[PDB]
Curated annotation (Swiss-Prot), chains C, D, E, F, G, H:
Full-length numbering of the shown residues: 2 to 133 of 329
Miscellaneous: This protein is translated as a fusion protein by episodic readthrough of the termination codon at the end of the capsid protein.
Protein name: Minor capsid protein A1
Annotated effect of mutating residue 33 to S: In strain: Qbeta_3_FR
Source organism, top-level taxon: Viruses
Species name: Escherichia virus Qbeta (Bacteriophage Q-beta)
Record's function text: Minor capsid protein.
Compartments it resides in: Virion
Length: 119, 103, 132, 132, 132, 132, 132, 132, 103
């Protein structure tokens, strides 16, 4: 009974910026890492980055494809993510998935998914 | 880690079980996951510790394998079980995904 | 690897407990990475400390070392806050050479992990009975 | 605990090798039970020793200790018997007071066996690099 | 300045607590002005002591020194009145020369006051985690 | 705690100056994290050191210690490099037992940061005159 | 900064081989950090060490130092273990004063990095020809 | 190869300054070649020296060596000539054996050249932060 | 401490925000207060730590400023917000008041 609602949206020409969101009401939000997953058309899916918990937006990590370009932020109002981006339409045409990230013995998987935007 | 998948298209559509395999470049020590992307766009988690189901899986799906070669079996296939399947490892911090096998 | 949060499900005697551990950092003076359980009072925390040492001119071997400390607490008579009644320890150490392949080391690790589920060590650890 | 044969399946780095261990009796000087590899030749086999120690006037609390060792054999040239080149060790010592319960010690055992399969320890033991 | 009552609102971890401190006088033998919290028993008081020393022929520097002492109390088993379980201390000292202008000293004061709200010292003080 | 850049706005006597501090890594002998002034030349910049210490067999309780120092530079005549004339210090040492909770230590931190903005301390530190 | 995994790309004479270095922790006695390549048999790994003089208030000369070493293996005719035939070393040292600026140090760094990709040095190191 | 004019492009922190070095001839007594920048007052020039051990039939170890130095000028208050305030040095050394190959030497060269443009060293040289 | 006020008469009566400033002889470290004396005779406290409102202020009033120069802004002025405004410092024991600006 867990859904992901807020999108943001946008069709940003290259050289611009865009900020997105998700709404993750339930599952006691402040205890799980939050990742961003994108799928380019064709080949496969890509992984963007995650953000940690500690009752505070304090530390996040990103993949090497988008490092210094994208920023994510954990807003602890109730459940708000962010995907502030820069210089999009060069190879960033994808469908964007925010996913809750549990673990088992320290190994990260993604149990709840949600489609929000495309670019 | 590069999760290579061999057959890239599974043609079976009725009856008997189907086998979809993955290969890792290194050894990943059973930290392999499985996913299902329906053409509506939704993505589901099925198996996370190579043999452990998610809470909404009717045990038609089952995984096995160790070392580098992992697998997933679908006994008694149905018409709602046709999608593209992705496997990905949870061992190392880049978390690369797999190619994809379309049912 | 990198210090992340380690959840550990299916833990305990029956297998229906969990234990989450949060990173606490790496000590510079001796190179000991730490994980601990979330809680206010520091004395009531379940903590796991791991460190691997490299051969200097005195020891010549690689030395991996894990430690586990579990305290238990109780609220005694005439007292308000709890206090540590007793401790439960565990201490693993591995010693390898400079020519050991990773198959030998992974064999020793998975051999010890498979021994800790055998009924010999279940009766020797949980019930405190020697092997006879 | 009855000393029997201990079969360990799905161990090693790939999760395919097995290990069958046969009992070797208790040592009456120090009470340490032993186990060795099926097959063998002596002084070339894989050994597992398990002891359980009781409190006395010298030591206050219980101590369960496991020492496993295994060597690497290199068949030399012009020789009919292989020799031991290098050896790999592991030894766990558990320490518990006289008031600890069953659930606590099973928790320490299960926590240790669950920590030996986390990528923190997979990357600390197989490759020899610490947590950063 | 002159010793007055110091209220301190928006104090604590969330920022919805207050702390009022009443003057207790200046000690003649060492020049230490005091503030404390209103209460009957002296052992249960939160107290702040400040003193600035001037250069004699031995130290040559100006020395401002603040101390903060917070005890906590509990009513144990079989006891009626509470007693101090533990203490929480803080001790600041500033050392200046004879030619230091007031801009330098106010810069050091407001730099320390702005560091005590940064997330580095929030995680280093409240959570007891070193900077890593 | 991740060592990042620390920006301190609205500090100084007038409440207009800022201060940007860059990390300088931990010192592996004693575990003291450091931070310095953006820009720089070395041995002329403003330094902030933060350490967190754990109890051992020598010390019973936790200790969080901050030492900040900043110098005053005077460009001499006929010289190309300024020299250090005088220096200003500050160092806070917090001491907490192993049973203290989160709210208590956040209270000590917030109480100290709130006391550094009272006119008692504004008149004790900026002008160097005690409380009468 | 904190030690991380450094992926050096486009190395070799042709310019397509890479190197991926994992951290190995900081030696406490001298403050020297280490990075090393993945692969079994830890004696046959490529190593890089880095070492900066620790910042103090009274340091006249800062010194930075880097040591690359690369071993080459030989599986000898009649032995199980591969040994180290020969070592390629590189020792780089940088020496700056306390009044030096950031652009001087960056200029020396990028000057050396741009000299090592010039024909004067890819003729003198790859071919061992002196400049005449 | 014969000494020529080496134009190093894209140096500096921003990456736009260049350096053009002219040959200064080979010292006969030790075989050390020199290059230096154009500009008046020869004492205020930037210098690079390079030195390879001379090839012989019975040489066990070849050694290559590079020394950058950069002076900074100060027109002092009350003098006509500018003097040298301070020196930035860099000493690079390479050490290979007689059985080493060309790809090993090229690999060590390009490894060092790719380390000097990595954040681990542009943080440790430009900012003088040790790796922790 | 002498709290000097410059303009001494604020002529604006509609619409846009108005700015009323004070100056201290020394620095008073944000211990500056604000008051409102209606011509009926009542006096109200508005702002006490240069940016912190009293419990009956509708946030049309807002203060700022640091060092010696402090200020007060009134967005969306109304006909009940016309009075004489006084600022005074709470740092030092004499507690001198300001001159007064009449709206």
């Amino acid at each position: 009974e867990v859904q992901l609602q807020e999108s943001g949206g946008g069709l940003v020409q290259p050289g611009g910026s865009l900020s997105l969101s998700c709404a993750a009401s339930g599952f006691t939000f402040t205890d799980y890492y939050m990742s961003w997953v994108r799928q380019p058309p064709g080949k496969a899916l890509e992984w963007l980055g995650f953000i940690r918990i500690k009752a505070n937006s304090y530390t996040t990590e990103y993949s090497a494809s988008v490092k210094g370009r994208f920023t994510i932020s954990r807003d602890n109002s109730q459940s708000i993510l962010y995907l502030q981006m820069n210089a999009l339409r060069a190879e960033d045409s994808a469908t964007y998935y925010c996913a809750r990230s549990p673990d088992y013995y320290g190994g990260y998987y993604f149990d709840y998914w949600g489609q929000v935007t495309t670019l | 880690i590069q999760m290579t998948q061999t057959t890239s298209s599974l043609s079976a559509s009725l009856g008997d079980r189907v086998t979809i395999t993955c290969r890792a470049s290194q050894v990943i020590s059973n930290y392999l996951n499985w996913y299902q992307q329906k053409p509506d766009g939704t993505v589901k988690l099925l198996i996370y510790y190579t043999s452990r189901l998610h809470s909404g899986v009717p045990s038609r799906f089952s995984g096995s394998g160790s070392g580098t070669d992992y697998s997933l079996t679908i006994s008694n296939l149905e018409q709602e079980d046709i999608a593209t399947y992705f496997c990905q490892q949870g061992n190392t911090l880049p978390y690369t995904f797999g190619g994809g096998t379309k049912l | 690897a990198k210090l992340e949060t380690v959840t550990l499900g299916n833990i305990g005697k029956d297998g229906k407990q969990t234990l989450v551990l949060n990173p606490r950092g790496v000590n510079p003076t001796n190179g000991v990475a730490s994980l601990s359980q979330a809680g206010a009072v520091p004395a009531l925390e379940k903590r796991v400390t791991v460190s691997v040492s490299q051969p200097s001119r005195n020891r010549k071997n690689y030395k991996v070392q894990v430690k586990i400390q579990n305290p238990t607490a109780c609220t005694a008579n005439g007292s308000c806050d709890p206090s540590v009644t007793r401790q439960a320890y565990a201490d693993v150490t591995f010693s390898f050479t400079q020519y050991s392949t990773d198959e030998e080391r992974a064999f020793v690790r998975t051999e010890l992990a498979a021994l800790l589920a055998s009924p010999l060590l279940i009766d020797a650890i949980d019930q405190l009975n020697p092997a006879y």
